[PDB]
Enzyme design. Structure first.
Site, PDB file in Angstrom:
ATOM      1  N   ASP A  34       7.828   4.806  13.470  1.00  0.00           N
ATOM      2  CA  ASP A  34       7.170   3.732  12.746  1.00  0.00           C
ATOM      3  C   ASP A  34       7.869   2.391  12.977  1.00  0.00           C
ATOM      4  OD1 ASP A  34       5.140   2.664  11.206  1.00  0.00           O
ATOM      5  OD2 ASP A  34       6.103   3.215   9.272  1.00  0.00           O
TER       6      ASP A  34
ATOM      7  N   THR B  30       0.886  -1.155   0.000  1.00  0.00           N
ATOM      8  CA  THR B  30       0.000   0.000   0.000  1.00  0.00           C
ATOM      9  C   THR B  30       0.930   1.211   0.000  1.00  0.00           C
ATOM     10  OG1 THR B  30      -0.117  -0.196   2.376  1.00  0.00           O
ATOM     11  CG2 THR B  30      -2.025  -1.014   1.092  1.00  0.00           C
TER      12      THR B  30
ATOM     13  N   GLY C  20       4.115   2.717  -1.655  1.00  0.00           N
ATOM     14  CA  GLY C  20       4.294   2.495  -3.087  1.00  0.00           C
ATOM     15  C   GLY C  20       5.284   3.469  -3.688  1.00  0.00           C
TER      16      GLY C  20
ATOM     17  N   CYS D 289      18.737  -4.315   0.573  1.00  0.00           N
ATOM     18  CA  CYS D 289      18.882  -5.289   1.661  1.00  0.00           C
ATOM     19  C   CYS D 289      18.070  -6.534   1.354  1.00  0.00           C
ATOM     20  CB  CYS D 289      18.407  -4.684   3.003  1.00  0.00           C
ATOM     21  SG  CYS D 289      19.251  -3.225   3.596  1.00  0.00           S
TER      22      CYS D 289
ATOM     23  N   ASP E 132      20.808   1.608  -0.720  1.00  0.00           N
ATOM     24  CA  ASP E 132      21.536   0.321  -0.731  1.00  0.00           C
ATOM     25  C   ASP E 132      20.486  -0.789  -0.538  1.00  0.00           C
ATOM     26  OD1 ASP E 132      24.247   1.062  -1.110  1.00  0.00           O
ATOM     27  OD2 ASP E 132      24.533   1.445   1.030  1.00  0.00           O
TER      28      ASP E 132
ATOM     29  N   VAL F  87       8.255   0.237  -3.844  1.00  0.00           N
ATOM     30  CA  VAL F  87       9.651  -0.085  -3.806  1.00  0.00           C
ATOM     31  C   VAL F  87      10.041  -1.121  -4.873  1.00  0.00           C
ATOM     32  CG1 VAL F  87       9.055  -0.303  -1.378  1.00  0.00           C
ATOM     33  CG2 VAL F  87      10.659  -1.901  -2.428  1.00  0.00           C
TER      34      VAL F  87
HETATM   35  C1  LIG Z   1       8.949   1.568   3.762  1.00  0.00           C
HETATM   36  N1  LIG Z   1       9.181   0.487   2.879  1.00  0.00           N
HETATM   37  C2  LIG Z   1      10.486   0.284   2.277  1.00  0.00           C
HETATM   38  N2  LIG Z   1      11.144   1.183   1.404  1.00  0.00           N
HETATM   39  C3  LIG Z   1      12.458   0.609   0.986  1.00  0.00           C
HETATM   40  C4  LIG Z   1      13.403   1.346   0.083  1.00  0.00           C
HETATM   41  C5  LIG Z   1      12.668  -0.686   1.584  1.00  0.00           C
HETATM   42  C6  LIG Z   1      13.880  -1.564   1.344  1.00  0.00           C
HETATM   43  N3  LIG Z   1      13.712  -2.883   1.048  1.00  0.00           N
HETATM   44  C7  LIG Z   1      14.792  -3.678   0.824  1.00  0.00           C
HETATM   45  N4  LIG Z   1      14.617  -5.087   0.551  1.00  0.00           N
HETATM   46  C8  LIG Z   1      13.402  -5.856   0.836  1.00  0.00           C
HETATM   47  C9  LIG Z   1      13.406  -7.265   0.812  1.00  0.00           C
HETATM   48  C10 LIG Z   1      12.225  -8.015   1.060  1.00  0.00           C
HETATM   49  C11 LIG Z   1      11.044  -7.338   1.322  1.00  0.00           C
HETATM   50  C12 LIG Z   1       9.813  -8.133   1.576  1.00  0.00           C
HETATM   51  C13 LIG Z   1      11.021  -5.928   1.319  1.00  0.00           C
HETATM   52  S1  LIG Z   1       9.493  -5.021   1.645  1.00  0.00           S
HETATM   53  O1  LIG Z   1       9.775  -3.851   2.412  1.00  0.00           O
HETATM   54  O2  LIG Z   1       8.821  -4.614   0.435  1.00  0.00           O
HETATM   55  N5  LIG Z   1       8.552  -6.015   2.545  1.00  0.00           N
HETATM   56  C14 LIG Z   1       8.418  -5.536   3.806  1.00  0.00           C
HETATM   57  C15 LIG Z   1       7.012  -5.037   4.044  1.00  0.00           C
HETATM   58  O3  LIG Z   1       5.996  -6.003   3.623  1.00  0.00           O
HETATM   59  C16 LIG Z   1       6.266  -6.498   2.258  1.00  0.00           C
HETATM   60  C17 LIG Z   1       7.687  -6.892   1.979  1.00  0.00           C
HETATM   61  C18 LIG Z   1      12.209  -5.193   1.078  1.00  0.00           C
HETATM   62  N6  LIG Z   1      16.039  -3.170   0.846  1.00  0.00           N
HETATM   63  C19 LIG Z   1      16.241  -1.855   1.131  1.00  0.00           C
HETATM   64  C20 LIG Z   1      15.136  -0.994   1.391  1.00  0.00           C
HETATM   65  C21 LIG Z   1      15.290   0.438   1.746  1.00  0.00           C
HETATM   66  N7  LIG Z   1      15.404   1.568   2.019  1.00  0.00           N
HETATM   67  S2  LIG Z   1      11.402  -1.064   2.502  1.00  0.00           S
END
Ligand SMILES: C/N=c1\[nH]c(C)c(-c2nc(Nc3ccc(C)c(S(=O)(=O)N4CCOCC4)c3)ncc2C#N)s1
Lengths: 252, 309
Positions: B136, B23, B25, B93, B91, B27
């Protein structure tokens, strides 16, 4: 970098505006004008001197990358001020900035029907410019506020209220009137303003018991040679500016 | 066409996958076209923005630019599009704590759980020391790199603090929201992030958010059924919040924090630290400095590096 927004004198001579046929003299004017406009708008919009100063720095830096021939100060100033107010946490509404800018630039003219196509365009123009400013600065909007440095210096020299008030005056005027901010770190500029304010008020700062001068407690780099060159440059442009000096002149 | 030395077009990155699909939006995982370096892209959403570039995005950018630390996500640069759009580049993750935790295959030793909490608390110490509230805290905002380095992420709701403060009350996901906010506080500080650290710590064993309310009142009820009930005896001056009585909190409830979690956790020190994080009065709630000092991080098995994910 850290040195990204600091320029050598050689670099200031080769400005984007010089590259389009604008005299060094004309350009300094264009800057002073923009800073006037910022000061005027900012006062009417009721924003802080800090916010205006931020907008002036944005302006100074914007014109190390863009030319006055392509982006006129009267277009940039309002956009810069709009942005600085958002960044400094005193946001002013887009419509309000537009309105105040309009009266400043065109005191006699009549405000357009906010319903009009001409007006909708200028709203859209300001937003476009803010975006071009953002990208020109590569999104680096945190400015070191020089007033903070001045207050600190005037404490170290146990200045009277008057001396300090004059030092702040020198400080604000340096931004409107000079490109010192593009060349020297905020702390060094502060020393320069305090130096000159002393000179003007005929105050003398006591040589430490160590025989060490005050500015040394403020910035390592700083030297009396540099300070005299700079206070002189700043004084001459003050002398050029009608009524400016009158404001700090001991009339009694 | 306009010169632009310091803002590169995002096309330098090659979009690999819409990882977020959130939700929030949106990434994207992406790959630098020359070096292969993986990054995360977030577009600044301008759907309802009538005031030019969102003041909210300026704030977040200001904060990511300030925060540079091993346990805080790293903003590499901001990119444009060449139309018009704007992207924050981070970067990349590999993992996120919420994902790892909901994965039945994934398993933590006591030693690694220690390490995770250590990095998290160390990140908090850093951001707070720098006058930032994260606002958060939740498992989904805690990332871990392929090499086992934990990063606090998502500063879109973060904000600087200082020094009677009037901050926004509706911050923090409901399940992770501390009592103070639910009782209408606007003069809150770092302790709100620590309450969140508590909920996350507990989640490292329960594998699931301990207090899943549906409304503020339901949330406040759940908290009371775990931490005892909000009493001026327990929480000096809690009465002066307007909603304190005006929100019929329960009355018999007593602290069951250690009893209800006793099952999952086992280790005495872990239970003691969690108990000191989920403290009702924000002013009696342990801080990151003391938490880091807690015997939990200084007894066997000592904290270890992260592996098998
Ligand atoms: C606030 N949300 C984010 N914005 C960014 C740039 C994020 C981020 N994510 C990764 N790798 C990574 C890997 C796996 C997942 C699942 C996700 S996810 O945030 O989209 N996720 C968590 C929430 O529920 C759905 C899945 C992210 N690396 C760096 C960043 C940064 N900044 S998260």
């Amino acid at each position: 970098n850290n040195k990204r927004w600091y320029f050598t004198r050689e670099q200031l001579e080769n400005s984007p505006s010089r590259r389009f046929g604008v005299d060094p003299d004309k350009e300094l004017s264009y800057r002073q004008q923009a800073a006037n406009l910022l000061q005027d708008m900012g006062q009417r919009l009721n924003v802080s001197q800090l916010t205006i100063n931020t907008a002036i720095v944005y302006m100074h830096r914007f014109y190390m990358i863009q030319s006055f021939t392509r982006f006129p100060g009267n277009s940039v100033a309002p956009a810069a001020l709009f942005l600085a107010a958002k960044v400094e946490g005193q946001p002013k509404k887009l419509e309000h900035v537009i309105k105040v800018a309009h009266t400043c630039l065109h005191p006699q003219e009549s405000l357009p029907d906010t319903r009009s196509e001409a007006y909708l365009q200028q709203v859209q123009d300001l937003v476009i410019l803010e975006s071009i400013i953002l990208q020109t600065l590569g999104f680096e909007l945190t400015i070191d506020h020089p007033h903070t440095h001045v207050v600190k210096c005037t404490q170290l020299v146990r200045a009277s209220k008057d001396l300090a008030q004059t030092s702040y005056f020198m400080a604000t005027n340096s931004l409107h009137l000079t490109t010192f901010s593009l060349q020297y770190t905020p702390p060094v500029v502060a020393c320069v303003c305090i130096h000159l304010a002393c000179k003007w008020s005929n105050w003398e700062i006591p040589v430490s018991t160590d025989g060490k001068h005050w500015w040394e407690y403020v910035d390592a780099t700083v030297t009396l040679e540099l300070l005299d060159e700079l206070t002189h440059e700043l004084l001459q442009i003050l002398e050029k500016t009608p009524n400016r000096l009158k404001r700090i002149w001991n009339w009694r | 066409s306009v010169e632009c030395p310091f803002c590169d077009e995002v096309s330098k990155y090659e979009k690999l996958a819409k990882i977020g699909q959130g939700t929030f939006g949106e990434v994207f995982k992406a790959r630098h076209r020359k070096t292969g370096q993986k990054v995360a892209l977030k577009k600044v959403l301008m759907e309802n923005e009538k005031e030019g570039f969102p003041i909210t995005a300026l704030r977040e950018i200001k904060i990511l630019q300030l925060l540079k630390h091993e346990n805080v996500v790293n903003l590499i640069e901001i990119c444009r599009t060449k139309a018009g759009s704007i992207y924050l580049v981070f970067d990349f993750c590999e993992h996120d704590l919420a994902g790892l935790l909901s994965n039945v295959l994934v398993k933590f030793t006591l030693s690694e759980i220690k390490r995770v909490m250590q990095m998290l608390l160390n990140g908090l110490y850093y951001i707070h020391r720098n006058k930032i509230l994260h606002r958060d805290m939740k498992a989904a905002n805690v990332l871990i790199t392929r090499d086992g380095v934990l990063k606090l992420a998502d500063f879109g709701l973060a904000r600087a603090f200082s020094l009677p403060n009037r901050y926004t009350n509706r911050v923090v996901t409901l399940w992770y929201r501390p009592p103070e906010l639910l009782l209408g506080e606007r003069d809150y500080g770092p302790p709100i992030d620590l309450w969140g650290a508590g909920c996350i710590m507990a989640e490292m064993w329960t594998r699931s958010p301990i207090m899943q309310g549906n409304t503020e009142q339901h949330q406040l009820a759940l908290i009371s059924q775990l931490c005892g009930s909000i009493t001026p005896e327990v929480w000096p001056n809690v009465d002066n919040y307007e909603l304190y009585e005006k929100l019929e909190l329960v009355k018999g409830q007593k602290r069951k924090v250690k009893d209800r979690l006793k099952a999952y956790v086992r280790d005495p020190y872990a239970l003691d630290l969690i108990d000191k994080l989920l403290v009702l009065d924000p002013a009696q709630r342990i801080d990151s400095d003391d938490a880091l000092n807690h015997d939990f991080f200084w007894s066997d098995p000592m904290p270890s590096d992260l592996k098998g994910m």
